[PDB]
Symmetry: C3
Subunit: 142 residues, 3 copies
């Protein structure tokens, strides 16, 4: 038995439409994954900045304690070791602008809001992904 | 020449089955990528916690050295600068519960096991992804 | 009306070819996403190492200030508290090899180049993903 023309035509039309449908749904899945990837990326950059600023915090304050100690004038025997330590600390300062040691001073800061908002308590969409399955058309004989 | 009905029917059935097969394999690929995404996410959260706890460690101990210094009574000229430094340090404490400065004290801690296990020496599945390709059926004339 | 054999054959051939095309394009999309995933992973490992080395930096220098303070001999009343603090600090040292406290000393370091190059100013490919859509063939009657 032969196959009806129109029938077969509509069948193949349905398969092509199924293919395009699956294709566009697939690009949507890719774009969702992509969005999540970008989120991860932002969280990482912000965490890095957080680490920089912690470096600046702790090293800055250690420097201030060292300077204060010099100024008091009670480090006599170990004064050279103190100077050297101050040198090391300045050498360990965060990758940013920071004011002189002598006395007190501010330091680096580069990460706000999402820095503390992206990673700390941030709802992360999991991975429920689906794609359609399709039925075949019954091509009827002419 | 016309096309055999049954033949064409089985052909289209095979194409639809190929399409569903590819579809379900594709969702599996998406779910694997998704799993890896979640892993990255966990590693990031744990690293963040690690940074918090380091902040608490270093700032806590700097505070203790400052308090000890006050208690010794040898900071006379720079005593106000010392108080101020203690204020700054308390202001820099990690985002968590920490006991009074005077004397010694504990501090923040929020990240165990995988915190040191997820990122430090953790086998990360790479990206070997594949999908099937399919053959066309020879539709035989009636 | 019946459907021409050859015509239908070429139609189904085109649909199968469309399916294989979409399939291979899809694996390419997966491999691109996978590459980006690996990048994120590397950035994370490097950030972790960065955190380790900051720990070593700050804790090492706090230890040195404590030792210097002992050596000066001006911590008399609080000398036990100082010893204890040194113990705590050594207990907080980074997960790596570090030389004795007394005097000065070096410490942990495990992350170079990309450690400061991967996350700090690194162009991250976004998510422009596409897949083809296909046309259906007009099967002509015999």
């Amino acid at each position: 038995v032969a196959a009806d023309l129109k029938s077969t035509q509509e069948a193949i039309n349905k398969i092509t439409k199924n293919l395009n449908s699956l294709s566009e749904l697939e690009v949507k899945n890719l774009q969702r994954l992509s969005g999540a990837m970008d989120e991860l990326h932002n969280e990482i950059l912000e965490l890095d900045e957080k680490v920089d600023d912690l470096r600046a915090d702790t090293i800055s304050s250690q420097i201030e304690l060292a300077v204060l100690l010099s100024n008091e004038g009670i480090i006599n025997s170990e004064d050279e070791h103190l100077l050297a330590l101050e040198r090391k600390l300045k050498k360990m300062l965060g990758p940013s602008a920071v004011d002189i040691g002598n006395g007190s001073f501010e330091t680096k800061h580069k990460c706000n809001q999402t820095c503390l908002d992206r990673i700390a308590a941030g709802t992360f969409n999991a991975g429920e992904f689906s794609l359609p399955t399709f039925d075949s058309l019954n091509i009827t004989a002419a």
